[PDB]
Amino acid sequence: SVATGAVSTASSSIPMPAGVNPADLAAELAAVVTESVDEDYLLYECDGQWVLAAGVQAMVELDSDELRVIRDGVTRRQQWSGRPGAALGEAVDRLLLETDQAFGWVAFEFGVHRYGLQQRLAPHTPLARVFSPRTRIMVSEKEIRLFDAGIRHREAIDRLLATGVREVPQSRSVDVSDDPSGFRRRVAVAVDEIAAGRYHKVILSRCVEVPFAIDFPLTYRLGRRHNTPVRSFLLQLGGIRALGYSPELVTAVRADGVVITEPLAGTRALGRGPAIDRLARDDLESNSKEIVEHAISVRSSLEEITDIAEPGSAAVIDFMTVRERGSVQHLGSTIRARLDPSSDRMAALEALFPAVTASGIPKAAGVEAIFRLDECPRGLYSGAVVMLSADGGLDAALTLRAAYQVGGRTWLRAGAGIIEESEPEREFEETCEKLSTLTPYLVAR
Ligand SMILES: [Mg+2]
Ligand SMILES: [Mg+2]
């Protein structure tokens, strides 16, 4: 599972009691374990394992202008040039010499350097934050595994197993029908650029301000019982709080060399009744426009994966099937390959980042159009939440279907892939469908 190879603990597992849900226990642990000590954390769900990385032992901060390594209140600064993946990889490999796993996030802006667009970034633009935790607690349906977990973490687990998790309170509604960023006018500009032949597709997005503060662990729990994401996360790291139900896996690199990527394209609503959802499912599977965009994205994923894979190892093992993602359903393909000996996990991330779902087609022209037609910098939105291991593992989830809090600002953000035949009204409605992954499940603070 996640706990394989170098990711190991000699500690005995605690068996999971019968009616206890792992997402609820892990999110409650994140709230309790860090409230009493005011410490940062990242909860990452990966293949049935909810990994709670609690406390910051060491932090790697990659900005557009410098790289910092912070440990025990001491900051080491350094200038960097060239690929941001090479700079981040070198600093994170040093963290992983002392600990078996590292966690964090990668901003959308991390992906602009491969296209020669980094000079458009403002000074001190955040690119990545990756830390090694003080403690890890892995929760699954079967058991709870502890990695360097003290008496305090054990007492917290024991109290939650004895009393049970908190009841999730009532949710508070938010209106997403307003368009203060002029998303529909920005879509019409992109449609005219595509008609003029500048590019084939660009992903544009809009922010939705939440007019009240939310409780991130309780909102995470409520939304997770109504969603089926590929990965999910809940974090409090520095100045940002975030939660999300990642619909798409940018890349998974295992220590045994297997590389996985799972591109998505096309969207229909889900959760509106069985017969209506099955009409939308049949429409999505047979719709010419959605099929063309899905095949063009698979062709792009195969090109990027071929650059970092052993020759003849790239393979589509699941092609163009409907993937259900709570309030929406999409076309998805699963691509598998073997990491070439001349390549590494950071090079694999750099080849597959940004996702087509975050940029466009061709990816270089989509990223350039996003600088002009979307609210920049995007930050965490359309970037990735990552988990790395000492033996070469990397798991990167696309940061979509997420909520954020920085300062007093709480917001949601959703986008749509705009093509030549796009109608601004249908693209706006598609952002509402994607926003419905979280809007009925916001628990106020
Ligand atoms: Mg190539
Ligand atoms: Mg589209």
Q: What is the three-state SS of 390-408?
A: CCCCEEEEECCCEEEEECC
- Expressed in angstroms and rounded, the spacing between residue 416 Cα and the centre of ligand 2 is 6
For residue 209, is it within any domain? yes
- Expressed in angstroms and rounded, the spacing between residue 308 Cα and the centre of ligand 1 is 8
Q: Residue 395 belongs to what domain range?
A: 11-445
- Expressed in angstroms and rounded, the spacing between residue 300 Cα and the centre of ligand 2 is 16
For residue 2, is it within any domain? no
- Expressed in angstroms and rounded, the spacing between residue 81 Cα and the centre of ligand 1 is 24
On whether the CB atoms of residues 177 and 53 are closer than 8 A, the answer is no
Q: Of 216, 223, 189, which is closest to residue 204 (Cα–Cα)?
A: 189
Q: Of 60, 34, 40, which is closest to residue 388 (Cα–Cα)?
A: 60
Angle, CA 361 vertex, CA 373 and CA 305 arms, to 5°:
130
The owner of tokens 């929760």 is: 139
CA distance 389 to 392: 6
Q: What is the resolution of this structure in A?
A: 2.1
Cis peptide before 354 (omega within 30 of 0): yes
Q: How far is CA 74 from the centre of its chain?
A: 29
Give the torsion sign (CA, 83, 88, 94, 96): negative
In order, the DSSP letters of 37-82 are TT--EEEEEETTEEEEEEEEEEEEEEESS-EEEEETTEEEEE---S
* 3-state percent helix, strand, coil for the chain, nearest multiple of 5: 30, 35, 35
- Residues whose CB is less than 8 angstroms from the CB of residue 411 and which lie 6 or more positions away in sequence, other chains included: 207, 208, 209, 210, 403, 404, 405
On whether the CB atoms of residues 330 and 252 are closer than 8 A, the answer is no
Catalytic amino acids?
248
- Residues whose CB is less than 8 angstroms from the CB of residue 210 and which lie 6 or more positions away in sequence, other chains included: 174, 403, 410, 411, 412, 442
Residue 363 is labelled as binding a ligand:
no
On whether the CB atoms of residues 204 and 416 are closer than 8 A, the answer is yes
CA distance 264 to 400: 12
CA distance between the termini of the chain:
35
Residue 267 is labelled as binding a ligand:
yes
How is residue 148 written in tokens? 């360097």
For residue 129, is it within any domain? yes
For residue 6, is it within any domain? no
Cis peptide before 133 (omega within 30 of 0): no
Which CATH number belongs to the domain containing residue 432 in this structure?
3.60.120.10
CA distance 380 to 398: 9
Closest listed ligand to the CA of 304: 1
How is residue 171 written in tokens? 């949710």
For residue 4, is it within any domain? no
Residue 417 is labelled as binding a ligand:
yes
- Expressed in angstroms and rounded, the spacing between residue 433 Cα and the centre of ligand 2 is 13
Number of alpha helices (DSSP H) and beta strands (DSSP E) in the chain: 10, 21
Q: Count other C-beta atoms under 10 Å from residue 354's C-beta.
A: 27
Residue 326 is labelled as binding a ligand:
no
Three-class SS of residue 250?
A: strand
CA distance 99 to 131: 10
Closest listed ligand to the CA of 309: 1
CA distance 394 to 128: 15
The long-range contacts involving 274-283, CB below 8 angstroms and separated by at least 24 positions, are: 277/329, 280/329, 281/322, 281/329
Three-class SS of residue 207?
A: strand
For residue 97, is it within any domain? yes
How is residue 245 written in tokens? 């139900």
Residue 201 is labelled as binding a ligand:
no
Three-class SS of residue 285?
A: helix
How is residue 248 written in tokens? 């798409």
What's the number of CA atoms in the CB half-sphere (13 Å) around residue 375? 14
Closest listed ligand to the CA of 351: 1
Residue 76 φ then ψ, to 5°: -105, 120
Domain count, the chain: 1
Method: X-ray
On whether the CB atoms of residues 302 and 341 are closer than 8 A, the answer is no
CA distance 310 to 199: 30
Q: Of 52, 85, 92, which is closest to residue 68 (Cα–Cα)?
A: 92
Angle, CA 109 vertex, CA 103 and CA 112 arms, to 5°:
125
SS (H, E, C) 303-320: HHHHHHECCCCCEEEEEE
Burial bucket for residue 60 (CB in 10 Å: 0-12, 13-18, 19+): buried
Query: Following CA atoms 354, 359, 365, 370 in sequence, which dihedral angle do they give, to the nearest 10 degrees?
Result: -120
Identify the helix (H) or strand (E) that includes residue 274: helix 274-286
For residue 135, is it within any domain? yes
For residue 152, is it within any domain? yes
CA distance 372 to 350: 23
Q: How far is CA 366 from the centre of its chain?
A: 20
Tell me how far CA of residue 83 lies from CA of 111, 310, 401, in angstroms. 10, 22, 28
